[PDB]
Design a protein around this nucleic acid. Structure first.
Ligand SMILES: [Zn+2]
Ligand SMILES: [Zn+2]
Ligand SMILES: [Zn+2]
Ligand SMILES: [Zn+2]
Lengths: 231, 231, 231, 231
DNA sequence: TGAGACATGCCCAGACATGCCCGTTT
DNA sequence: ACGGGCATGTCTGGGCATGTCTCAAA
């Protein structure tokens, strides 16, 4: 079974938010909106902001899980490479197989589901600190997005979800994460192969569309991309 | 007896949906909008969606059984060549003789009717989560649609039924499959054969777009339209 | 264990000889000396000549065995593809797994060694028929040099050997065989990629060789290829 | 404890020999007379010849062991990386953790010396088949020479040794290994960086040659000799 | 540390490979 | 009865991907 990744703000307008990269511990963790992807170094900290309109009811929790992005791999549980699964790199509260880890919260709980066989981590929801309108959370990924025996270069996706005391869904969101050794580089590169997927390709193509009422449906459809593009 | 490929939605809405993606020569899957055919590689994952209207009673199961579309052999069991049939992989819960399997679903069941010796698989039916509005089971075909001493190029058609808790009918639909090597290829090419095979008649509407795949999906997203005027 | 393929005429000057192709059942079996390779169709007859100086002692036998040509494959026994291993295409005297078969000799014996696990066939040595100075023998190969589960396109090598009553070696020889569906074609093609491996490549390269006495060793060495080439 | 590598021909003039393969990135194994190094891909065949002036006593054995080359790690037992170790390969006759395996020899024995803890495999010595004047033996290296949590990019040295019935040293020789994914390329480079690092001292005669493949062949014959006057 | 410059495992668009199915000549 | 397109599985050199080492400048 492959858990959903469908965005769903729920009745609390739950959604995620990230920070920029170019100061202190930034090159060791950068986010590119154009890709909605987080580039980060093995075992280094990645901060994430939880935004919510109203306020979650008592007992509310926040969970984080990973699924592969590509379809031929989804059904495959995202484990940790074997080499690393055998290392003292564990605060103690978190099992060695788990890829994702919450940093700085002894209230965090790790789960290795009996049925789905999926790996996840949960923490009690906490209200924003007076001043800011979000609750930042810290994550750490324990294997490179290219370890053999592990993810094996298969792009992964992190699904953050807001569940109630009973576990029921209340809101969901997600983002792509690539663990590596040169976040800055890999980000540029990828932001480049994109800034080269629009210019490099410019040729035009036509299409025959029968139906007076149908043409206006494709017209107003394509007349829409003509705006959100040249800008 | 012989299984019917009658497009029987049922009284709930047991239909089919497939992911819209490119058709370059490097992908493992790619659907035939037109021919309702599939082009997944050997042993790769096949994402099959299942929309509906009303939730069937607590027990409805889904099943998969293959059939050769060609009238000549449309009465012969769809097995595996003794080669791969003599091969066991990471799956100690799914017989080597069966063609179709489901990925991640320990609730699955593979059986050969003691009357038809038919290869079929039945996996429990789960309803859509909160937010989303459908469900997709992950199928995996274990043999090329051209392996000598088996299917042997004989085109096929997967019959996905929605039989209730007592094996009785309650929904059904099907689609063609082509376990080939370059899914993009035998999709770019097995498609043009229906893009020069006839000239036809009619007066469309002129509408040109932009983009390579951006459009390759656009003109592609032009087939699912006029199909509501014949059968 | 990979049996030897080292040519060895022995004390009887044992060696092999073939015929030309371009008459009757020729296109269904051709030999190209430039390659010392026999191109032949599945299940069709291939004739081979056994030449020997003196005359083998009483009890002498002749064996034929196949080994893969490429090194990463030698250690692999040359079996028959699974599809074919299950067919009535057997005179009865010869097991279905065996690739090589002697045609027209009920005195022939097939072996499936207990240790080497190799497949072989043997026949009592017979003197030339008055007139010719050789003993022709007939072979048949029961799988295409490209059957999956079988040789799988891996080039094979046939080692004919002259053993005594006890089994001791007395002479050995060998030749390359490719089973296919278009011997003529495949032969030309290959005789072409060769007639294109000498002309296509002509550039010269130099080499520094210290040692007065050593230079004359490479001189008389290369001064040798200058003769057997332009001719 | 660290085993000796000091060559030792012994009273039977024991020493190894290798084939003469090329460098196309399609080769799976390829030795270097220059570097006296083998470049084989993961789990592929590496034939090693065994020459001996006189035949050994009844019971003589050949044992092959690996050692890290570098003085720093020369005391660290060579094991398979965590990943490949957790893979039971179609060779249940051999320990899942042994780096070196032998192919096609049921009489082979794998070892885990209690004291030293080193790993090695042994096989009974076999006299050269008539006509031939040496014995080859087939090995496989179950792990790239850079698996992490394994050799981890550390060069190793395989020490073939000839021991007797009562395991006494009889002779010994060795060679360098590297398990890649491009034995062709990797060797070209490594061989090239030597074919530049040295200038040597002397008077060199000049010999022009025709043909890249042929030239490369002499060049090899010549670099091998240029080693027969170094160490 | 920040940017090259390697090192070394792997993708791949574009050929090649190889069994066949026509159709038509010596 | 041997040259010709054809349906399909597959090889391959040129390039790309991804961790890590190395030297000079805030
Ligand atoms: Zn790892
Ligand atoms: Zn098959
Ligand atoms: Zn076969
Ligand atoms: Zn390994």
């Amino acid at each position: 079974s492959v858990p959903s990744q469908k965005t769903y703000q729920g009745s609390y307008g739950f959604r995620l938010g990230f920070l920029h990269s170019g100061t202190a511990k930034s090159v060791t963790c950068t986010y590119s909106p154009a890709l909605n992807k987080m580039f980060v170094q093995l075992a280094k900290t990645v901060p994430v902001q939880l935004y919510v309109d109203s306020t979650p009811p008592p007992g509310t929790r926040v969970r984080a899980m990973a699924i592969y992005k590509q379809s031929q791999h989804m059904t495959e549980v995202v484990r940790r490479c074997p080499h690393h699964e055998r290392s003292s790199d564990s605060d103690g509260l978190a099992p060695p197989q788990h890829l994702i880890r919450v940093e700085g919260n002894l209230r965090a709980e790790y789960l290795d589901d009996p049925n789905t066989f999926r790996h996840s981590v949960v923490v009690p929801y906490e209200p924003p600190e007076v001043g800011s309108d979000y609750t930042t959370i810290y994550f750490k990924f324990m294997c490179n997005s290219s370890c053999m025996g592990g993810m094996n270069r298969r792009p992964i996706l992190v699904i953050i979800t807001l569940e109630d005391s009973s576990g029921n869904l209340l809101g969901r969101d997600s983002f792509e994460v690539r663990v590596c050794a040169c976040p800055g580089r890999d980000r540029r590169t990828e932001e480049e192969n994109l800034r080269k997927k629009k210019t490099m390709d410019g040729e035009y193509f036509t299409l025959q569309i029968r139906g007076r009422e149908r043409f206006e449906q494709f017209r107003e459809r394509n007349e829409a991309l003509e705006l959100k593009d040249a800008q």
